Symmetry: C3
Subunit: 231 residues, 3 copies
């Protein structure tokens, strides 16, 4: 484990995702509202999945070597197995908050799968220049997601209860800022141009992951928007 | 790229799926009917997924070598990753058109997963004679799907609006004819008996894919069956 | 095939899953109740999936070698591909029986995916002591599932029709007893401590699989709880 300088950030990430999972699990014990139960189930699964994948990276299972640039490059593939399941769950939290229609939910989840799937292909591609073709396709899929979150959901939240509109607006802004950083870290990190070393890259993804999952969840599960209007 | 004679058909397929995706995306911009939005989302995702997998084959990522018959045989595995997601989406288009019940939808999607999954196992199997055992199981799963589309959905469409009944009947006939060709191309192509060479096999799958996805989508999204009855 | 002593139990399992699939398929022909159709579709898919994965193990495709303990250990990875899809389908049978809320269904299916996913990682892990870390995480996920089936569903079934309450109680008890045996067989078998040899381990999993899928299905599909109350 300790033979890799980035191990400290993988261990911290593992701990923070595990602690986040347990807090949400305990906090959700005393909840019977069927609407609130939906948000607790979605939001608790997110850091639980991330916990297992951070642990796999810490123990060395989620790491492979990819030859490109005449070098064997360490690629943590477990990140994409994490994101494949956690990013659509996070979008479902937002879509259920605004009572989005089914067709829009399917478009979001499908574009998200394309985003993560093409990012994985780009991470494992051995022809250096082709890695950035996949990065560009994946980034186009992300821009579609961000467009929908702004010019489809925002207008839908305003016609909703005030507390669900204000909570959505906050979580929307958090998501757009944090998610946009991921393609940048990829491009300048060891998967892309190799400007930033792997140990610093790992620290950046850990800050982003914890903020986008545990920070996101703390804002959502403390809001009254997750409960139905009741007397 | 150009070192493979089949590259021209992979490049054409990539272009036609990309163009198809963009047309459906633009055409769906001016749509607010929640029913129509469902069909546009399903139908636009189909060629978008196929685009990415054709590109992976063009660039050489979606290709592996499988030893059988005393030879290293080029097997494009990316086809099955495509079909795993696009064939159930196409069946969902048909099932939603006739307002099929949930139990029937699950049976269709499950049989479809078995069809594609066993076809993938057959494509990667190293014992030559066993490849055709998997082909037979996969073909049995397809025949179940075709039976349901005829002796379960057809009777359901007649009790529906006339425009949804006539549109379903057309898309049903297109699907049964085109899908039935796939097991035949597999059997006589490089995955099976090896009668037809890979470059011709690739041309045939490209014609079938574009017809079953973009041609299918053009018929559906030009129909009024996708809109609810409104004044 | 016959070069492996466990082949006899893989062949028996294949036959019993295939026969089970055909019986459920025939029995479900004469069913039009939309509620009953749901249970028949879920319950017939379970042994059909298991059939294909037992066949892959029989023919040698679903087997790999994992080095640990200074030895190349035969690991049947196809079991986890089976369980990944069949265990959530079995939980869906139970959840639909008691009309569970959506949030609870998602929590069950998500915990089940974590259970199977971490068990697969543990089966393929090359550092011997780490294999049991994954076993423990997977077992914690199972205990969560069992808790929900007892202290969330049981109370919900009592407020239901008497026949659905008594049928659920029976299937609940069958599930908790049979599922609990799996982590024990893993721990003492070739994936874990290696006390029980592989051929005996394979026999035990076959008895458990057939009971948990075909036996489970025979109890459910003979009950009147799967039909709506009708005159
Ligand atoms: C009902 O809706 C509320 C349940 O949602 C919340 C239910 C959760 C979604 C269930 C998923 C958690 C499982 C219990 C998994 C247990 C293993 C975890 C990875 C444990 C990690 C923390 C600890 C080991 C440090
Ligand atoms: C509606 C939305 C959900 C739609 C989703 C969008 C999606 C279509 C976007 C594209 C996804 C696609 C790129 C997934 C590729 C997975 C692949 C990286 C797995 C590893 O295989 C890659 C190479 C080794 O580098 O295999 C070496 C050769 C091996 C012999 C490969 C044989 C196994 C194949 C991988 C079998 C295909 C399985 C499916 C891809 C499983 C789904 C994986 C997940 C990442 C989507
Ligand atoms: C709301 O419902 C309508 C949206 O459906 C339609 C929405 C679509 C389903 C969203 C999926 C498309 C994404 C925007 C993916 C973008 C990358 C594409 C693969 C681009 C391919 C064409 C071009 C690069 C040649
Ligand atoms: C309700 C419906 C959706 C049900 C679906 C029906 C489905 C059950 C039908 C059978 C599907 C099954 C054959 C999928 C097999 C995937 C497999 C080809 C992936 C590549 O692995 C094959 C060998 C190399 O040749 O791995 C070499 C050895 C490696 C060490 C393998 C270890 C990884 C395992 C593959 C882990 C299992 C992952 C799941 C199979 C992922 C789903 C893939 C998709 C193709 C279903
Ligand atoms: C409508 O709801 C009822 C259909 O459910 C029941 C429908 C089933 C869920 C459909 C799935 C079965 C498919 C027909 C697959 C056929 C291949 C099987 C694996 C055959 C195995 C048995 C035989 C080959 C020994
Ligand atoms: C809501 C719920 C459904 C959530 C589900 C819970 C889930 C997150 C729990 C953890 C699942 C995770 C451990 C799955 C790992 C699959 C992995 C074993 C496949 C084989 O790859 C392992 C190594 C060889 O030993 O690959 C060698 C290196 C290769 C180069 C690997 C590159 C391919 C990657 C495997 C791509 C990721 C694909 C996804 C993991 C596909 C889903 C598989 C299924 C088992 C979940
Ligand atoms: C909890 C994890 C989250 C919210 C991860 C989000 C990840 C992304 C938005 C990743 C995007 C990428 C691109 C847009 C292209 C480059 C490759 C990716 C996958 C890093
Ligand atoms: C857009 C792609 C489509 C509609 C693909 C359809 C593919 C099939 C219907 C494939 C069927 C197969 C068999 C029936 C057995 C032989 C292997 C397959 C997977 C080619
Ligand atoms: C039809 C198959 C069924 C119902 C299989 C159930 C399997 C389990 C409940 C497996 C549980 C495991 C653990 C709890 C940890 C050890 C590894 C597993 C996956 C065997
Ligand atoms: C979206 C965030 C990207 C900003 C990356 C900042 C990295 C600064 C760290 C110093 C770079 C290390 C280079 C010298 C080793
Ligand atoms: C009462 C609110 C705080 C509860 C404690 C939460 C502990 C989980 C770890 C959170 C750290 C990361 C927060 C986002 C920066
Ligand atoms: C379902 C369509 C299958 C028909 C295949 C027709 C192939 C004819 C092309 C000529 C065969 C090439 C053999 C000589 C190289
Ligand atoms: C107005 C209808 C035609 C629009 C142009 C569609 C261009 C997408 C490519 C379609 C070619 C394949 C059609 C099926 C044979
Ligand atoms: C949950 C069931 C686990 C019980 C396992 C009993 C196995 C007894 C078979 C004899 C053990 C073989 C050891 C000598 C070869
Ligand atoms: C009339 C009920 C029996 C029908 C025959 C079922 C045959 C399928 C194989 C069942 C054997 C396994 C039963 C569970 C132990
Ligand atoms: C490729 C993996 C995608 C599945 C991720 C799991 C979450 C799916 C959310 C589905 C939302 C409901 C759509 C109607
Ligand atoms: C194995 C991958 C299957 C999933 C394909 C994605 C489409 C799923 C459609 C689900 C239809 C809704 C069923 C109720
Ligand atoms: C185009 C939709 C408007 C909202 C999206 C904001 C774009 C942020 C740019 C992200 C940069 C990634 C490289
Ligand atoms: C048996 C259901 C009737 C409709 C299915 C038509 C069968 C077409 C044969 C396809 C040939 C594939 C080898
Ligand atoms: C803790 C929830 C109560 C019901 C679960 C029964 C636990 C059975 C123990 C299984 C042993 C697996 C190692
Ligand atoms: C080795 C660098 C080659 C540059 C390729 C950049 C491709 C980016 C595509 C974005 C449209
Ligand atoms: C090398 C050819 C061996 C023939 C096997 C055919 C199997 C087909 C099974 C269809 C029932
Ligand atoms: C080689 C045996 C090492 C023992 C590790 C046991 C780990 C079990 C963790 C359960 C909390
Ligand atoms: C609940 C605390 C979980 C912390 C265990 C993971 C941290 C790795 C320490 C080496
Ligand atoms: C929108 C046009 C997309 C065409 C790019 C793919 C074709 C491959 C050319 C080499
Ligand atoms: C319907 C009977 C299915 C039996 C075939 C599988 C058994 C393997 C025999 C070698
Ligand atoms: C993106 C930063 C999240 C901050 C988490 C703190 C929330 C406390 C209510
Ligand atoms: C299967 C052939 C499809 C033909 C596509 C043309 C549709 C234009 C309306
Ligand atoms: C767990 C044992 C199941 C027994 C199956 C027999 C059911 C006949 C109704
Ligand atoms: C109005 C809410 C502002 C939230 C933005 C937070 C950016 C990290
Ligand atoms: C909408 C604000 C985008 C912020 C992008 C930050 C990328 C590091
Ligand atoms: C490929 C772009 C299509 C141009 C608009 C077609 C008419 C909606
Ligand atoms: C009555 C519609 C006929 C459609 C059949 C088309 C076959 C390619
Ligand atoms: C229902 C007509 C079937 C046509 C099969 C064509 C196979 C090449
Ligand atoms: C009251 C029903 C008892 C069922 C338990 C069966 C254990 C195999
Ligand atoms: C609730 C009874 C548990 C039985 C466990 C059996 C494990 C072999």
């Amino acid at each position: 484990i300790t033979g890799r300088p980035e191990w400290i950030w993988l261990a911290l990430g593992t701990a923070l995702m595990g602690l986040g999972t347990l807090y949400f699990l305990v906090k959700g014990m005393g909840v019977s509202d069927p609407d609130a139960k939906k948000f607790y189930a979605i939001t608790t699964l997110v850091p639980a999945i991330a916990f297992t994948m951070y642990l796999s990276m810490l123990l060395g299972y989620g790491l492979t070597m990819v030859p490109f640039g005449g070098e064997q490059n360490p690629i943590y593939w477990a990140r994409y197995a994490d994101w494949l399941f956690t990013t659509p769950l996070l979008l479902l939290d937002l879509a259920l908050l605004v009572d989005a229609d089914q067709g829009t939910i399917l478009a979001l989840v499908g574009a998200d799968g394309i985003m993560i799937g093409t990012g994985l292909v780009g991470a494992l591609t051995k022809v250096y220049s082709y890695r950035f073709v996949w990065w560009a396709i994946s980034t186009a899929a992300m821009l579609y997601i961000l467009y929908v979150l702004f010019f489809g959901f925002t207008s839908k939240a305003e016609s909703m209860r005030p507390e669900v509109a204000s909570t959505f607006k906050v979580l929307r802004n958090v998501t757009v800022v944090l998610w946009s950083a991921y393609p940048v870290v990829w491009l300048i990190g060891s998967e892309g141009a190799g400007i930033v070393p792997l140990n610093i890259e790992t620290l950046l993804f850990m800050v982003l992951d914890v903020s986008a999952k545990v920070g996101f969840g703390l804002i959502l599960l403390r809001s009254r928007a997750i409960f139905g209007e009741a007397e």
